[model samples]
Target chain A: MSWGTELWDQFDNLEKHTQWGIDILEKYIKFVKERTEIELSYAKQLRNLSKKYQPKEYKYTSCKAFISNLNEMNDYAGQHEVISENMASQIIVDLARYVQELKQERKSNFHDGRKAQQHIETCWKQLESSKRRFERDCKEADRAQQYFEKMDADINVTKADVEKARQQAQIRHQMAEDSKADYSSILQKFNHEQHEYYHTHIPNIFQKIQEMEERRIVRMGESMKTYAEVDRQVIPIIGKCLDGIVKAAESIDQKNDSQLVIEAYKSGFEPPGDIEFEDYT
Target chain B: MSWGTELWDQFDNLEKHTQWGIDILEKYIKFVKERTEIELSYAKQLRNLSKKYQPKEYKYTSCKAFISNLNEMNDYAGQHEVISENMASQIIVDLARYVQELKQERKSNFHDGRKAQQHIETCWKQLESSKRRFERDCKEADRAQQYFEKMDADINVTKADVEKARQQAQIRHQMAEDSKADYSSILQKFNHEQHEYYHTHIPNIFQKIQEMEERRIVRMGESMKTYAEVDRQVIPIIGKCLDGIVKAAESIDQKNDSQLVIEAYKSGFEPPGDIEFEDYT
Candidate 1:
């Protein structure tokens, strides 16, 4: 049904609903915008965390190798950095303009659609008023004709008076006929206008709004996909960072370090024997 | 090389290096701890973001379906929630006590090792002092003998004088001999003590410190793996949340929405035809 057999509110309900989609789209944009804000926040915090544990040259090969893994952690932080930057580019920037675009289209569509809807909406009211006026005039003419006939047949009325009453009845009938003709044309004009408004004007605009909402929904699907993809891109690098730390830990040589310390502290002299008596005589 | 060919600083270098590992391990704990803080912060913010776009029942199927995706986003937020919670439980609490454990072990090791090191270190100084005393007594004994013999030959002394001077020189020589005997005994005692300190006392303590550093390194490796694993565990569910959003978006039907709106906004009245004329003639 292009215009379903019983549409209530004559695009009034559609206006509210299309407005709802616009709101939903705008909120969706904010929702996504806020998520990226978290991404940026999380990215910055991780970068700072890596900085806090940032490394230097340690002397022993054991912890020395371990210290270098701190450098690997910077790589891990960089992943989240990429995640935030990509999300900002993809979802935030993309959706940021979407709501305004939707609203502009809806506003413009409303301007055109409402003009036609209100035009026909009020036409129905005026058409009913015109019908009431034409009917009352016809009733007035019939009443005048009945009175004239009653008076003309009565013994008390003269030919000249009856003839005057007949003229008055004729005037009433003429006015009723004039009202009928004017109303007939006005009614025909409203019928045409109402049909055009229902079948063509409103539905055309409604369909476009429907398409706008659908496209907005589809774009959200893409936005969700990109959101997850940002994390996916960083997962491998994170694993790499993790692997490097383990390898660094394995590099620690305990037995070798034990020897290093002993070598440092070794007393060079050989242990001496018992005391011998000495004389200076 | 149990005690490598020439270990310098006798655990002094090891001390600095082991301390470096301690600091590195502590920083690593802080690094992972800070990262989980970001997780908690990110989780909270995402939750708030979802709340910002939280939905209600929308009338149309088009945007109505889109609104439900916000609920799905909450599911995504929940994934991060689990991520942070797991990290807090696994890394933060586990590593929180580790640095203290390390420091306590290190402090205790230092106490025992330093006691033995200083005992041998000062023993070397006392041995040198003992040697100097012995040498000085020998010189004193020789000087007495030379002066006494010279006087006796010059006839500057009577027989009694020669005998008394000879006795004084003999006394000096005897004292020198006694000092030599005492120094020898002390030297031997110190040599034995130094050997025990080097071969047994220091290296044993050093080996323990070395093992401590290795164990600490290994723990950090585990920490790093767990860090990445936290994210890895949540990834599948995050994908689930993202997939739900896309699926919800796909549920929007543009063409069907058009008819729904028409059905809602349809003007119920049929367009009237030309107005009829009723004449009263």
Candidate 2:
């Protein structure tokens, strides 16, 4: 507010600097999109890799539990894919359009700022011309009186010259007087505009830019916070998936397996009895 | 265990069945190795992908924090790599050798069982031959005595034939009685071996196989549990890495950015002031 100089230069500096800042935010949005790709890429890798966990053939292992564990692995992989798809699920999308809206908003605000400044500048120019006309007329009146006095003091001057100077002086004085009053009224109008520019127009213009900038900053921060939130939601489910892997592994029953082997493959063969005596006569 | 008739057929069934089971466990070891490659592959993909996140040139964006966030991406990727290398470090390595030991132990167990069963079989064969010899002698004695009595009744036979029959009958009778006593003694000795085979040898042989099989089952179950444990250790760190990304994004300050604009790019321009009225009259 303290006029260490004009505010327009300050506005320009802030405008340019802020524009560059927004570019980074826009870049940050690009990063969010890129993060989406990495998530998707990882999900694909996990899915392809999980499919390989299957046995080429598990006929011998009696691995009823193992097959189910493999199924759990696939489920784990599915969750990761879910995370991938959900990333594109509106959060990044909304932010993507926000930058565009902010851009248009910024353009309008600066345009209004320039327009407001133009009002004061154009008003200042008209007042400048009015003051110039007033000064020119006053100077002409002084010159006109001087010529009349000179002709009267020199008795050798013609009466016509003295008469012409007297009429011209009065006529110039009348023009100067009228122009001075007009210049004062113009000055009053200029002051009114100047006050409005400083108080109302400048504040309005700068405040809009400030409001927009604040929105951009806080919204960007919120975006960061939300991006984190999506992953947090998935993390707990992922933890459970990990738990399933461990628990499934734990479910293997060794004693039960022994019984399975006995029931499935027990070879049926009669034991040879002790030999009986045979008589030979 | 109650005698399900002879135990050898049961033993063979279990032996072959468990052998097939181990082959599957060995296959599982192969799976662990495959999982290692997937982890490594994912790591490589992430590193390559993360390299692209770098700016071709960031001259326009003023993104100091963004550059740091890219570093976090690399860090998150690094932790994944850590998990890959560490998987091979000790856990999988130790488990790989475990199946081999179990294989040899199973082999020894089955071998001992067959050896013990062979002992019982060989003993029973000797007893069978002794019983045959005893029966043959008793029948011969009966035939000799009938011939002696027939010759006495007929009176038509020579006195020499009757005398020979009488002597042969007595000799045959003595041999039958002696052989019968020997057969009885042999039966008692066979009974001792039969009791040993049924109660001691069968139990010891089968118990060894049972113990080995139990070890295999429990160890395999433990292995499944341990495999799950490795992934769990990596998960928590991954969650924190997710957190770093969000916090870094949250660090963008809007008002502070506005101040930065004022300090960095503020243009120095004098604002046009109110024009003073010029007067010469």
Candidate 3:
């Protein structure tokens, strides 16, 4: 199959998994937020009751209850943090691969454009090859006439100058040959890189995209299952019960601290626990 | 200045820095790609020349040249990889911080919405409070009449029964009082948490946003300068040169391999190097 087809298929499947995972995380965050609110309410009431009763003794019990409740809520929050971070990382990995693939595609297209331009240049050179040869021949013929006109000497004296001119011509011919060799070499290297960029490098990037997509889909599904089973149903109920216990202690503290003891004590504490009046610590 | 203005300023500055870094990276990639092409061309020519010459020694020299050239080109490609990776990472960090700041703004808006909703709910509760008390009194009176009709006894026994009933009523009243105490405590706790969420927690989050913005701007600017000064100019050039050397070697390697002739003057044998024949390794 073509790489594009493979990538499209991967994206289609992975997106389904990602959307499901996002739904699960949203639900999980909601659950955690609600639980946090409930616990915070309970902690506030307990703290107020301790102050109202001026309960010297029950302070430790009130504080302990608050601490325990806070710990449980925080544990839920911590778990949610872990799951969110993991899912986010997986999503980012997939996205980065997808983006890199797009960059590679653009690069490949650019390389192809360059190659086409090179071909056009070559074609133009071929079409004008005869014209260039004719021009060169004409220039050489003129130079020959000029050289003949410029050099006038006795036979023996002219021999060394002739030899020197011949040597200079040879050097120029060699330099032209070297220049052509170098230019051709450079152009060949450019073509090789263009070939590699379009074929091998781009395909390699696509392969990475495919791999990350597969992993993301697999992990996303797992994350969804974890959220539903462990987070949504269990964590909230535990949080609610924790809130209730912390609240009951604070009611007793307030009664002890009330100025009208008779009126305050008339409504006895329900779900009775140690009041702050007994133990200061 | 307002946070919005500060945010805009930071956004504009970071945007310019990121763009500048991207431009440099783009130029570097292009340079590397073009230089690699030049070296590969030289390698190809050497291979072709070795084939036509039918000189085994010259062919070997050409082979060595091709191999060396390709190796040099490979070195340049490696450096390009490093530069691209660093630039990509830097860009992502800056972009992520920008998105985070936007999220903070959204979160602040959400809090405002919640506060408005809370205010409306409290207003409605106040309006309904007196009406609920009158309805509760009427229901209690009706329950008393039902109790009278259901039970029969002499007038005195009924009177005694009414006294006992009053005590039971008192206990029930006591329970209501206790419930009110618990409810008030819960309310106090809820209010405290609400206060913290509004005042402390929200402010803390905003503070973090400001800190992140500052850090992001500084880091982005530093990365941009590093890229412009060193990576963009130096890395690609050095890599291209290294790649050129490797390509030259590769071209030389592709030439034919041949045995070297060792000269023994007495035996009328001429050395390959003495005659300026191609050097083979």
Model 2: residues with Cα > 4 Å off, grouped in runs: A1-9, A55-62, A131-157, A165-182, A273-281, B1-19, B36-84, B87-89, B102-213, B238-273
Question: Which segments of candidate 1 are over 4 A away from where they belong?
Answer: A1-9, A55-96, A111-113, A117-281, B2-5, B8-11, B55-79, B82-96, B108-113, B121-176, B253-281
Scored by DockQ, the top model is 1
lDDT of 1 by residue, A1-281 (tens): 54323442355665677677666667666766666667667767766766766553444555555455656766677776776776556667767777678778878877887787679879878877777888899899999999899988999889888998899899999998888877777788888887777677766775665566667656665665566566556556766776676667556665565555555466674433433434333
Better of 1 and 2 by TM-score: 1
DockQ computed for model 2 against the true two-chain complex using alpha carbons = 0.27
Write the residue-wise lDDT of candidate 2 on A97-132 in tens digits.
899898998898888878988887897798888888
Error of 1 at B14 (Å): 3.6
Order the numbered candidates by DockQ, best leading: 1, 2, 3
Identify the CAPRI category of the predicted complex in candidate 2.
Answer: acceptable
Interface RMSD of 2: 5.4
| Ranking of candidates on lDDT, top first | 2, 1, 3
lDDT of candidate 2 over B1-281, digit per residue (tens)? 22233344577666766687687778667776777777777767666666776778232122544665677668877887887687644667877788878888888877877887788778768777777777888789889999999987876899998999999999999888887777777777777777766667766777777767767767766777776777766667667776786767666665565555554544565445665666665
TM-score for each prediction? 0.76, 0.71, 0.22
Query: Considering summed lDDT, which 10 consecutive residues are worst modelled in model 2 chain B?
Result: B57-66
TM-score between model 2 and native = 0.71
DockQ (CA atoms), all models: 0.32, 0.27, 0.01
lDDT of every predicted structure (CA atoms): 0.68, 0.71, 0.39
